[PDB]
From Swiss-Prot, chain A:
It is found in: Cytoplasm. Substrate binds at T78, D79. Disulfide bonds: none annotated. Belongs to the asparaginase 1 family. One of its GO terms (cellular component) is cytoplasm. It comes from Wolinella succinogenes (strain ATCC 29543 / DSM 1740 / CCUG 13145 / JCM 31913 / LMG 7466 / NCTC 11488 / FDC 602W) (Vibrio succinogenes). Homotetramer. It is an enzyme of class 3 (hydrolase). This is L-asparaginase. It comes from the Bacteria. It catalyses: L-asparagine + H2O = L-aspartate + NH4(+).
């Protein structure tokens, strides 16, 4: 029975009380693994902060550096699981499995999804093919690469998707199968190290629309934003008044990164915007681009260096 | 051949009838001349990322004027793809006619290899003149698909198949001009809409905020200072705010600026009676829209009320 640590960031989704309640709710897990539990935070995922991301990444690195620890499972709220997973995908210095799992229905609900999700997450954590896949989300019998995953629906048990790729594998009643792997660097291959970081740079997200404004750019600058993700119309397009405010932000040394409100596809590099300039976030989404820009700004504010990061990760 | 007016809001989507842009479209797709008597008008000349409420009002008034006359069978509106969904939704709630109103665009410029504009426009004319297109509400015709304005969104940055209706699916198809409907909206539109913009010259200001972990109050505060009458919050998951942003949104709602919860996720309903105590905090739940279409509906709501309960009923109806 391989040793796995479950890190709870909140309540039960189905030696730490939350993890003991998971083992009681899903007793099959005890036949698969020797489970250790820790409570890292006790919040809804909409309450997450960069401090919790740092605490979690540092703790995961400590645990995976231990010979006895085969893998880490993190129980997490679904709303921002994609952001924590992506952050960890760039900051965990191990090839050992790191699996995020949650539940779209409360454990007390009819037809609660947490027990099967957690049972499947454990099977993914201990599977030999799970090594060097990067951080993964396991939801609804699916294995999603952290780079690609997002919550695409407000309520559905099948809310998680990878709209630009698709799931990298499946897990069905604990049977784990991989079909693809990410070719974008992750985990050990990532240049990012947060071992010496106490606070992440401030990065705001703006939502673009017709008859848009300058006042939200201005408020982000005044509040000491070091980066701004613009969730542009279509292929990363701003409204004119907003574009002028973004150019002002860029002149002040704030890194402006163009993404899209649309949900999928690449926000493509466009020289006339950028190479005069802004960063093109390419095939991410605004909230994952925010994570990558926060990590980039820990080591550079140079547009060209940050564009290379977006064009690589 | 039925009388159809093409209203251009930007440039040529493919490649006098009353507008040079429309003369160019007829030269590029001369087969449309066999389908309809085409009149052209140029409402605006902008990329759709530059759209304003002023243009929306001008366009909706002109569509209402054309369709109110017995001689006009339908209108086609050529439009940039980025905000076609907002314009279509606005018109769906403000056009007082059952006659077809078809929005069409091109994901690739007309100069491109494999330009989608010609086939999209050809198909749009066939949808406009089809007898089954009546009382469908405003539609978007893209990539051989007919989408209901309530449901339609641009879901991809670049793809010719970028348009989708993630909560419902297309309502019909058009394949080399052959039109088939399979569904229709059951949410009130057009004639059944309570909204009347005939006298309105300026729409209420409505901002949209993008939620994330470690969120802020300062963007709510800036929207309030700029005279927002409403705020759409594109929340995490099922419309959930970060606590600091929640405090600021509560302040907004309680000061009389309507706060309507939507979601950043892309599909599904931002539901009532979930994790957010909407009655306590003073919020509206936008249910099954997305932030940018919720903004349109809120802007229209605000023309006639700021009452939380009345606006909740509007979101629960349209």
């Amino acid at each position: 029975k391989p040793q796995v640590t479950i890190l709870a960031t909140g309540g039960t989704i189905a030696g730490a009380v939350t993890v003991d309640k998971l083992l009681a709710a899903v007793p099959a897990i005890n036949d698969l693994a020797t489970i250790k539990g820790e409570q890292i935070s006790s919040i809804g995922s909409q309450e997450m902060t960069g401090k919790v991301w740092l605490k979690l990444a540092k703790r995961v690195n400590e645990l995976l550096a231990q010979k006895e620890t085969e893998a880490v499972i993190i129980t997490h709220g679904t709303d921002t699981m994609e952001e924590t997973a992506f952050f960890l995908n760039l900051t965990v210095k191990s090839q050992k499995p790191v699996v995020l799992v949650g539940a779209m229905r409360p454990g007390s609900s009819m037809s609660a999804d947490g027990p099967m999700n957690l049972y499947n997450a454990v099977n993914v954590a201990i599977n030999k093919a799970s090594t060097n896949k990067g951080v993964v989300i396991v939801m609804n019998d699916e294995i999603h690469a952290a780079r690609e995953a997002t919550k695409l629906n407000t309520t559905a048990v099948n809310a998680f998707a990878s709209p630009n790729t698709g799931k990298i594998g499946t897990v069905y009643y604990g049977k784990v199968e991989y079909f693809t792997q990410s070719v974008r660097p992750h985990t050990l291959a990532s240049e990012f190290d947060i071992s010496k970081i106490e606070e992440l740079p401030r990065v705001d997200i703006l939502y673009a629309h017709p008859d848009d404004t300058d006042v939200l750019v201005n408020a982000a600058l005044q509040a000491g934003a070091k980066g701004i993700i613009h969730a542009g119309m279509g292929n990363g397009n701003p409204f004119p008044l907003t574009q002028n405010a973004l150019e002002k932000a860029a002149k002040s040394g704030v890194v402006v990164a163009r993404s899209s409100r649309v949900g999928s596809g690449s926000t493509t590099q466009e020289a006339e915007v950028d190479k005069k300039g802004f960063v093109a976030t390419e095939s991410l989404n605004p909230q994952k681009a925010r994570v990558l820009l926060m990590l980039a700004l820990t080591k550079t504010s140079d547009r060209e260096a940050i564009q290379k990061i977006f064009s690589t990760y």
